[PDB]
Amino acid sequence: GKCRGLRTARKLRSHRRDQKWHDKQYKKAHLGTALKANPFGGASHAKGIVLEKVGVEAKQPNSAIRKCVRVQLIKNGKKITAFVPNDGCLNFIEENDEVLVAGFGRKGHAVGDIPGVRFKVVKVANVSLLALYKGKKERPR
């Protein structure tokens, strides 16, 4: 059972300490391994350079092509894949366009029917792609 004395505090306080590491979230945060291995240095957004444009296939019960891009970063130098959410919007992207990327919403985990994508593009050439879609603006030719 449980210790439950009047002068047992060192034991309990100890027991909770070494036994808290067996929780996934605490362990992830308070160790640097996930942090130094995250392409973003504990950050939300990041700018980077385009170097390819590819199409990723989906999972089994669906069938499509999800129009992603290979992207290199400025600060770190690493490489990643990213997704372009909307109909007809890949054509808005040229080569070497200095985009801004972000997460998707699951904090490091893959989302949906895409095999291994956890970043989405937001701003190309500093003109707010969503606005560009809606026709509130055009690109800086």
Partner: protein
């Protein structure tokens, strides 16, 4: 990879319909009166069939 030729198919394949004008609707405080006098007492049909505010039929 794959076949990227077919981007923006449907969004370019659809016709261009235009919109209309009807009015500007009341804004702010008057609009809340509209909802009150519309919902809780306007004409009060006793039997609603649990029918909704946009049920088109």
């Amino acid at each position: 990879h794959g076949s990227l030729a077919r981007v923006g198919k449907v969004r370019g394949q659809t016709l261009k319909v235009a919109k209309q004008e009807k009015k500007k609707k009341r804004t702010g405080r008057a609009k809340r009166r509209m909802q009150y006098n519309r919902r809780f007492v306007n004409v009060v049909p006793t039997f609603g069939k649990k029918k909704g505010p946009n049920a088109n039929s």
